[PDB]
Amino acid sequence: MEEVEQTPLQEALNQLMRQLQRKDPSAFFSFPVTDFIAPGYSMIIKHPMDFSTMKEKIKNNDYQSIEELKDNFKLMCTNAMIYNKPETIYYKAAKKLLHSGMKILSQERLEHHHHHH
C-alpha cells in the first residue's frame, strides 16, 4: 500500500524547478559546477547542490518534501553567495533565485492560503 502517491508529488516539484530555472539567474547554475563552470565550488563549497543536480534527484524521488528541497536549494544559494562576492549579477542572481524558489515552493503545498507565523 502507498506508492503511486509519490509520482504526483514529483510532478509538482518538477514544475517548481522548471518555473524557477526559467527565471534567468538559474540559467548559469542549471548545470553541475566545476573547475571551469565555477570559480572553485568543488574546492570550497563541498555540497553546492546545483539546480541540475537537485532536479536530477527529484526525478528519483529524492526530493518530495519542502524541507528536503529547501535544505538543498538553500545550500546552493548560501554556498553560491559565500563563494561569490557582489561582482556583477552573480550575487544578485543567487539572492533573486532564493526569493523565487521560496515563493514557488508555497504553490505545490497550498492547503488554503497560509500556515502559521
PDB file of N, CA and C in Angstrom, residues 32-110:
ATOM      1  N   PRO A  32      25.900  21.203 -13.103  1.00  0.00           N
ATOM      2  CA  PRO A  32      26.837  20.906 -12.012  1.00  0.00           C
ATOM      3  C   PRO A  32      28.124  21.719 -12.130  1.00  0.00           C
ATOM      4  N   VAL A  33      28.338  22.632 -11.177  1.00  0.00           N
ATOM      5  CA  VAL A  33      29.529  23.484 -11.186  1.00  0.00           C
ATOM      6  C   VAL A  33      30.811  22.661 -11.211  1.00  0.00           C
ATOM      7  N   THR A  34      31.832  23.203 -11.870  1.00  0.00           N
ATOM      8  CA  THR A  34      33.122  22.534 -11.984  1.00  0.00           C
ATOM      9  C   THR A  34      34.261  23.544 -11.865  1.00  0.00           C
ATOM     10  N   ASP A  35      35.475  23.109 -12.209  1.00  0.00           N
ATOM     11  CA  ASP A  35      36.647  23.978 -12.156  1.00  0.00           C
ATOM     12  C   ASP A  35      36.613  25.048 -13.252  1.00  0.00           C
ATOM     13  N   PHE A  36      35.635  24.952 -14.157  1.00  0.00           N
ATOM     14  CA  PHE A  36      35.502  25.907 -15.254  1.00  0.00           C
ATOM     15  C   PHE A  36      34.179  26.648 -15.143  1.00  0.00           C
ATOM     16  N   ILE A  37      33.112  25.893 -14.885  1.00  0.00           N
ATOM     17  CA  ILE A  37      31.787  26.467 -14.727  1.00  0.00           C
ATOM     18  C   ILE A  37      31.719  27.304 -13.446  1.00  0.00           C
ATOM     19  N   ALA A  38      32.510  26.913 -12.443  1.00  0.00           N
ATOM     20  CA  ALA A  38      32.554  27.626 -11.171  1.00  0.00           C
ATOM     21  C   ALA A  38      33.980  28.059 -10.834  1.00  0.00           C
ATOM     22  N   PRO A  39      34.134  29.090  -9.980  1.00  0.00           N
ATOM     23  CA  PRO A  39      35.457  29.596  -9.578  1.00  0.00           C
ATOM     24  C   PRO A  39      36.204  28.684  -8.610  1.00  0.00           C
ATOM     25  N   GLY A  40      35.576  27.584  -8.279  1.00  0.00           N
ATOM     26  CA  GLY A  40      36.156  26.615  -7.365  1.00  0.00           C
ATOM     27  C   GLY A  40      35.153  26.103  -6.347  1.00  0.00           C
ATOM     28  N   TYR A  41      33.893  25.961  -6.768  1.00  0.00           N
ATOM     29  CA  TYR A  41      32.834  25.474  -5.884  1.00  0.00           C
ATOM     30  C   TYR A  41      33.218  24.134  -5.262  1.00  0.00           C
ATOM     31  N   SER A  42      33.681  23.203  -6.091  1.00  0.00           N
ATOM     32  CA  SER A  42      34.086  21.878  -5.613  1.00  0.00           C
ATOM     33  C   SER A  42      35.250  21.953  -4.618  1.00  0.00           C
ATOM     34  N   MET A  43      36.056  23.013  -4.707  1.00  0.00           N
ATOM     35  CA  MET A  43      37.208  23.177  -3.822  1.00  0.00           C
ATOM     36  C   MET A  43      36.826  23.805  -2.478  1.00  0.00           C
ATOM     37  N   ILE A  44      35.915  24.781  -2.501  1.00  0.00           N
ATOM     38  CA  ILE A  44      35.498  25.471  -1.276  1.00  0.00           C
ATOM     39  C   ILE A  44      34.121  25.016  -0.785  1.00  0.00           C
ATOM     40  N   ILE A  45      33.154  24.960  -1.695  1.00  0.00           N
ATOM     41  CA  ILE A  45      31.802  24.541  -1.357  1.00  0.00           C
ATOM     42  C   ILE A  45      31.615  23.057  -1.693  1.00  0.00           C
ATOM     43  N   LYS A  46      31.872  22.207  -0.701  1.00  0.00           N
ATOM     44  CA  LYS A  46      31.767  20.757  -0.864  1.00  0.00           C
ATOM     45  C   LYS A  46      30.386  20.325  -1.356  1.00  0.00           C
ATOM     46  N   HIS A  47      29.333  20.836  -0.717  1.00  0.00           N
ATOM     47  CA  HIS A  47      27.967  20.478  -1.089  1.00  0.00           C
ATOM     48  C   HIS A  47      27.203  21.680  -1.652  1.00  0.00           C
ATOM     49  N   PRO A  48      27.482  22.064  -2.915  1.00  0.00           N
ATOM     50  CA  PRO A  48      26.807  23.187  -3.565  1.00  0.00           C
ATOM     51  C   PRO A  48      25.389  22.832  -4.004  1.00  0.00           C
ATOM     52  N   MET A  49      25.227  21.616  -4.532  1.00  0.00           N
ATOM     53  CA  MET A  49      23.930  21.127  -4.999  1.00  0.00           C
ATOM     54  C   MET A  49      23.286  22.104  -5.980  1.00  0.00           C
ATOM     55  N   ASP A  50      23.799  22.117  -7.209  1.00  0.00           N
ATOM     56  CA  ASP A  50      23.282  23.000  -8.254  1.00  0.00           C
ATOM     57  C   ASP A  50      21.849  22.636  -8.622  1.00  0.00           C
ATOM     58  N   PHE A  51      21.213  23.497  -9.414  1.00  0.00           N
ATOM     59  CA  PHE A  51      19.839  23.266  -9.853  1.00  0.00           C
ATOM     60  C   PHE A  51      19.744  21.999 -10.705  1.00  0.00           C
ATOM     61  N   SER A  52      20.823  21.682 -11.430  1.00  0.00           N
ATOM     62  CA  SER A  52      20.860  20.489 -12.277  1.00  0.00           C
ATOM     63  C   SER A  52      20.965  19.219 -11.434  1.00  0.00           C
ATOM     64  N   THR A  53      21.791  19.264 -10.389  1.00  0.00           N
ATOM     65  CA  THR A  53      21.974  18.112  -9.512  1.00  0.00           C
ATOM     66  C   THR A  53      20.709  17.836  -8.703  1.00  0.00           C
ATOM     67  N   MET A  54      20.118  18.895  -8.144  1.00  0.00           N
ATOM     68  CA  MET A  54      18.903  18.757  -7.346  1.00  0.00           C
ATOM     69  C   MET A  54      17.736  18.231  -8.189  1.00  0.00           C
ATOM     70  N   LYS A  55      17.536  18.804  -9.384  1.00  0.00           N
ATOM     71  CA  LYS A  55      16.446  18.375 -10.270  1.00  0.00           C
ATOM     72  C   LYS A  55      16.568  16.891 -10.629  1.00  0.00           C
ATOM     73  N   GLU A  56      17.800  16.438 -10.865  1.00  0.00           N
ATOM     74  CA  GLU A  56      18.044  15.039 -11.202  1.00  0.00           C
ATOM     75  C   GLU A  56      17.618  14.143 -10.046  1.00  0.00           C
ATOM     76  N   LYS A  57      17.871  14.610  -8.823  1.00  0.00           N
ATOM     77  CA  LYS A  57      17.495  13.869  -7.626  1.00  0.00           C
ATOM     78  C   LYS A  57      15.973  13.810  -7.483  1.00  0.00           C
ATOM     79  N   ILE A  58      15.286  14.893  -7.873  1.00  0.00           N
ATOM     80  CA  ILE A  58      13.825  14.936  -7.791  1.00  0.00           C
ATOM     81  C   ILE A  58      13.210  13.820  -8.631  1.00  0.00           C
ATOM     82  N   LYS A  59      13.765  13.609  -9.827  1.00  0.00           N
ATOM     83  CA  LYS A  59      13.275  12.564 -10.728  1.00  0.00           C
ATOM     84  C   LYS A  59      13.384  11.170 -10.090  1.00  0.00           C
ATOM     85  N   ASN A  60      14.253  11.030  -9.085  1.00  0.00           N
ATOM     86  CA  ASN A  60      14.442   9.752  -8.397  1.00  0.00           C
ATOM     87  C   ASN A  60      13.748   9.739  -7.030  1.00  0.00           C
ATOM     88  N   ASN A  61      12.747  10.612  -6.855  1.00  0.00           N
ATOM     89  CA  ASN A  61      12.005  10.711  -5.596  1.00  0.00           C
ATOM     90  C   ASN A  61      12.908  11.126  -4.433  1.00  0.00           C
ATOM     91  N   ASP A  62      14.069  11.693  -4.752  1.00  0.00           N
ATOM     92  CA  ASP A  62      14.986  12.169  -3.727  1.00  0.00           C
ATOM     93  C   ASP A  62      14.423  13.439  -3.094  1.00  0.00           C
ATOM     94  N   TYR A  63      13.672  14.199  -3.897  1.00  0.00           N
ATOM     95  CA  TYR A  63      13.043  15.427  -3.440  1.00  0.00           C
ATOM     96  C   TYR A  63      11.526  15.285  -3.478  1.00  0.00           C
ATOM     97  N   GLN A  64      10.925  15.144  -2.303  1.00  0.00           N
ATOM     98  CA  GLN A  64       9.476  15.014  -2.180  1.00  0.00           C
ATOM     99  C   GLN A  64       9.004  15.639  -0.868  1.00  0.00           C
ATOM    100  N   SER A  65       9.809  16.565  -0.341  1.00  0.00           N
ATOM    101  CA  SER A  65       9.497  17.248   0.895  1.00  0.00           C
ATOM    102  C   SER A  65      10.017  18.675   0.851  1.00  0.00           C
ATOM    103  N   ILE A  66       9.213  19.585   1.372  1.00  0.00           N
ATOM    104  CA  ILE A  66       9.554  21.001   1.416  1.00  0.00           C
ATOM    105  C   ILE A  66      10.875  21.237   2.152  1.00  0.00           C
ATOM    106  N   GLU A  67      11.123  20.443   3.195  1.00  0.00           N
ATOM    107  CA  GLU A  67      12.350  20.551   3.982  1.00  0.00           C
ATOM    108  C   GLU A  67      13.561  20.083   3.173  1.00  0.00           C
ATOM    109  N   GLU A  68      13.380  19.006   2.410  1.00  0.00           N
ATOM    110  CA  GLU A  68      14.451  18.456   1.584  1.00  0.00           C
ATOM    111  C   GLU A  68      14.838  19.438   0.480  1.00  0.00           C
ATOM    112  N   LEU A  69      13.829  19.965  -0.214  1.00  0.00           N
ATOM    113  CA  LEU A  69      14.052  20.918  -1.294  1.00  0.00           C
ATOM    114  C   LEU A  69      14.697  22.202  -0.777  1.00  0.00           C
ATOM    115  N   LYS A  70      14.150  22.745   0.311  1.00  0.00           N
ATOM    116  CA  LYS A  70      14.666  23.980   0.899  1.00  0.00           C
ATOM    117  C   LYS A  70      16.098  23.816   1.402  1.00  0.00           C
ATOM    118  N   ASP A  71      16.371  22.718   2.104  1.00  0.00           N
ATOM    119  CA  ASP A  71      17.707  22.471   2.648  1.00  0.00           C
ATOM    120  C   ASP A  71      18.772  22.442   1.549  1.00  0.00           C
ATOM    121  N   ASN A  72      18.492  21.724   0.460  1.00  0.00           N
ATOM    122  CA  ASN A  72      19.439  21.621  -0.650  1.00  0.00           C
ATOM    123  C   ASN A  72      19.470  22.906  -1.479  1.00  0.00           C
ATOM    124  N   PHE A  73      18.290  23.421  -1.834  1.00  0.00           N
ATOM    125  CA  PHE A  73      18.195  24.655  -2.615  1.00  0.00           C
ATOM    126  C   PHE A  73      18.867  25.806  -1.866  1.00  0.00           C
ATOM    127  N   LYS A  74      18.623  25.871  -0.557  1.00  0.00           N
ATOM    128  CA  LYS A  74      19.212  26.905   0.288  1.00  0.00           C
ATOM    129  C   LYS A  74      20.731  26.749   0.353  1.00  0.00           C
ATOM    130  N   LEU A  75      21.206  25.500   0.348  1.00  0.00           N
ATOM    131  CA  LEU A  75      22.642  25.233   0.406  1.00  0.00           C
ATOM    132  C   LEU A  75      23.360  25.862  -0.785  1.00  0.00           C
ATOM    133  N   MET A  76      22.804  25.698  -1.990  1.00  0.00           N
ATOM    134  CA  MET A  76      23.412  26.280  -3.188  1.00  0.00           C
ATOM    135  C   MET A  76      23.360  27.804  -3.136  1.00  0.00           C
ATOM    136  N   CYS A  77      22.225  28.348  -2.692  1.00  0.00           N
ATOM    137  CA  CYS A  77      22.056  29.799  -2.590  1.00  0.00           C
ATOM    138  C   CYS A  77      23.050  30.388  -1.591  1.00  0.00           C
ATOM    139  N   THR A  78      23.136  29.769  -0.412  1.00  0.00           N
ATOM    140  CA  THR A  78      24.051  30.221   0.634  1.00  0.00           C
ATOM    141  C   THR A  78      25.508  29.988   0.223  1.00  0.00           C
ATOM    142  N   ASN A  79      25.777  28.823  -0.368  1.00  0.00           N
ATOM    143  CA  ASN A  79      27.122  28.478  -0.812  1.00  0.00           C
ATOM    144  C   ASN A  79      27.541  29.326  -2.015  1.00  0.00           C
ATOM    145  N   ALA A  80      26.570  29.678  -2.859  1.00  0.00           N
ATOM    146  CA  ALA A  80      26.839  30.488  -4.043  1.00  0.00           C
ATOM    147  C   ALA A  80      27.162  31.928  -3.663  1.00  0.00           C
ATOM    148  N   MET A  81      26.469  32.452  -2.649  1.00  0.00           N
ATOM    149  CA  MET A  81      26.695  33.826  -2.201  1.00  0.00           C
ATOM    150  C   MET A  81      28.006  33.954  -1.423  1.00  0.00           C
ATOM    151  N   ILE A  82      28.371  32.914  -0.667  1.00  0.00           N
ATOM    152  CA  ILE A  82      29.609  32.944   0.110  1.00  0.00           C
ATOM    153  C   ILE A  82      30.832  32.907  -0.811  1.00  0.00           C
ATOM    154  N   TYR A  83      30.805  32.037  -1.829  1.00  0.00           N
ATOM    155  CA  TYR A  83      31.920  31.940  -2.768  1.00  0.00           C
ATOM    156  C   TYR A  83      31.673  32.791  -4.020  1.00  0.00           C
ATOM    157  N   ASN A  84      31.015  33.938  -3.843  1.00  0.00           N
ATOM    158  CA  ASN A  84      30.732  34.841  -4.953  1.00  0.00           C
ATOM    159  C   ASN A  84      30.346  36.224  -4.441  1.00  0.00           C
ATOM    160  N   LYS A  85      31.330  37.120  -4.384  1.00  0.00           N
ATOM    161  CA  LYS A  85      31.100  38.485  -3.924  1.00  0.00           C
ATOM    162  C   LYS A  85      30.290  39.263  -4.959  1.00  0.00           C
ATOM    163  N   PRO A  86      29.624  40.361  -4.543  1.00  0.00           N
ATOM    164  CA  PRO A  86      28.812  41.190  -5.448  1.00  0.00           C
ATOM    165  C   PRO A  86      29.650  41.799  -6.570  1.00  0.00           C
ATOM    166  N   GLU A  87      29.950  40.973  -7.570  1.00  0.00           N
ATOM    167  CA  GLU A  87      30.755  41.387  -8.712  1.00  0.00           C
ATOM    168  C   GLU A  87      29.897  42.055  -9.781  1.00  0.00           C
ATOM    169  N   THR A  88      28.924  41.312 -10.304  1.00  0.00           N
ATOM    170  CA  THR A  88      28.036  41.827 -11.343  1.00  0.00           C
ATOM    171  C   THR A  88      26.587  41.402 -11.084  1.00  0.00           C
ATOM    172  N   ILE A  89      26.232  40.190 -11.516  1.00  0.00           N
ATOM    173  CA  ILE A  89      24.881  39.670 -11.324  1.00  0.00           C
ATOM    174  C   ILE A  89      24.899  38.303 -10.623  1.00  0.00           C
ATOM    175  N   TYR A  90      26.095  37.806 -10.276  1.00  0.00           N
ATOM    176  CA  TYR A  90      26.218  36.514  -9.600  1.00  0.00           C
ATOM    177  C   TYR A  90      25.612  36.570  -8.200  1.00  0.00           C
ATOM    178  N   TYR A  91      25.954  37.619  -7.447  1.00  0.00           N
ATOM    179  CA  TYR A  91      25.436  37.792  -6.091  1.00  0.00           C
ATOM    180  C   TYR A  91      23.925  38.014  -6.116  1.00  0.00           C
ATOM    181  N   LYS A  92      23.478  38.930  -6.977  1.00  0.00           N
ATOM    182  CA  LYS A  92      22.055  39.231  -7.107  1.00  0.00           C
ATOM    183  C   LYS A  92      21.292  38.021  -7.649  1.00  0.00           C
ATOM    184  N   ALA A  93      21.934  37.253  -8.534  1.00  0.00           N
ATOM    185  CA  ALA A  93      21.312  36.066  -9.119  1.00  0.00           C
ATOM    186  C   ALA A  93      20.926  35.062  -8.035  1.00  0.00           C
ATOM    187  N   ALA A  94      21.855  34.798  -7.115  1.00  0.00           N
ATOM    188  CA  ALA A  94      21.608  33.859  -6.021  1.00  0.00           C
ATOM    189  C   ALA A  94      20.487  34.354  -5.112  1.00  0.00           C
ATOM    190  N   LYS A  95      20.533  35.640  -4.761  1.00  0.00           N
ATOM    191  CA  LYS A  95      19.512  36.238  -3.899  1.00  0.00           C
ATOM    192  C   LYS A  95      18.139  36.212  -4.574  1.00  0.00           C
ATOM    193  N   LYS A  96      18.093  36.642  -5.837  1.00  0.00           N
ATOM    194  CA  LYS A  96      16.846  36.667  -6.601  1.00  0.00           C
ATOM    195  C   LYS A  96      16.263  35.262  -6.745  1.00  0.00           C
ATOM    196  N   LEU A  97      17.135  34.284  -7.011  1.00  0.00           N
ATOM    197  CA  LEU A  97      16.709  32.896  -7.171  1.00  0.00           C
ATOM    198  C   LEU A  97      16.110  32.356  -5.875  1.00  0.00           C
ATOM    199  N   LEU A  98      16.751  32.669  -4.745  1.00  0.00           N
ATOM    200  CA  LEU A  98      16.273  32.218  -3.438  1.00  0.00           C
ATOM    201  C   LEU A  98      14.836  32.681  -3.191  1.00  0.00           C
ATOM    202  N   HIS A  99      14.567  33.952  -3.490  1.00  0.00           N
ATOM    203  CA  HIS A  99      13.231  34.518  -3.307  1.00  0.00           C
ATOM    204  C   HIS A  99      12.220  33.852  -4.243  1.00  0.00           C
ATOM    205  N   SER A 100      12.647  33.584  -5.479  1.00  0.00           N
ATOM    206  CA  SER A 100      11.786  32.944  -6.474  1.00  0.00           C
ATOM    207  C   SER A 100      11.471  31.501  -6.081  1.00  0.00           C
ATOM    208  N   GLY A 101      12.498  30.762  -5.663  1.00  0.00           N
ATOM    209  CA  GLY A 101      12.302  29.379  -5.265  1.00  0.00           C
ATOM    210  C   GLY A 101      11.406  29.241  -4.048  1.00  0.00           C
ATOM    211  N   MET A 102      11.538  30.173  -3.104  1.00  0.00           N
ATOM    212  CA  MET A 102      10.732  30.150  -1.884  1.00  0.00           C
ATOM    213  C   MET A 102       9.253  30.391  -2.186  1.00  0.00           C
ATOM    214  N   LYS A 103       8.962  31.423  -2.981  1.00  0.00           N
ATOM    215  CA  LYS A 103       7.578  31.753  -3.337  1.00  0.00           C
ATOM    216  C   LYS A 103       6.918  30.606  -4.102  1.00  0.00           C
ATOM    217  N   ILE A 104       7.643  30.029  -5.061  1.00  0.00           N
ATOM    218  CA  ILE A 104       7.116  28.917  -5.852  1.00  0.00           C
ATOM    219  C   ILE A 104       6.921  27.671  -4.982  1.00  0.00           C
ATOM    220  N   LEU A 105       7.814  27.474  -4.007  1.00  0.00           N
ATOM    221  CA  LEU A 105       7.726  26.324  -3.105  1.00  0.00           C
ATOM    222  C   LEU A 105       6.395  26.303  -2.345  1.00  0.00           C
ATOM    223  N   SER A 106       5.774  27.478  -2.178  1.00  0.00           N
ATOM    224  CA  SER A 106       4.497  27.578  -1.473  1.00  0.00           C
ATOM    225  C   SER A 106       3.307  27.453  -2.435  1.00  0.00           C
ATOM    226  N   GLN A 107       3.535  26.826  -3.591  1.00  0.00           N
ATOM    227  CA  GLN A 107       2.482  26.634  -4.580  1.00  0.00           C
ATOM    228  C   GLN A 107       2.054  25.168  -4.638  1.00  0.00           C
ATOM    229  N   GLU A 108       3.033  24.264  -4.564  1.00  0.00           N
ATOM    230  CA  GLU A 108       2.765  22.825  -4.600  1.00  0.00           C
ATOM    231  C   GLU A 108       2.027  22.363  -3.339  1.00  0.00           C
ATOM    232  N   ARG A 109       2.356  22.975  -2.199  1.00  0.00           N
ATOM    233  CA  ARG A 109       1.734  22.624  -0.926  1.00  0.00           C
ATOM    234  C   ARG A 109       0.910  23.792  -0.382  1.00  0.00           C
ATOM    235  N   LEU A 110      -0.235  24.047  -1.017  1.00  0.00           N
ATOM    236  CA  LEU A 110      -1.116  25.135  -0.603  1.00  0.00           C
ATOM    237  C   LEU A 110      -2.441  24.593  -0.067  1.00  0.00           C
TER     238      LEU A 110
END
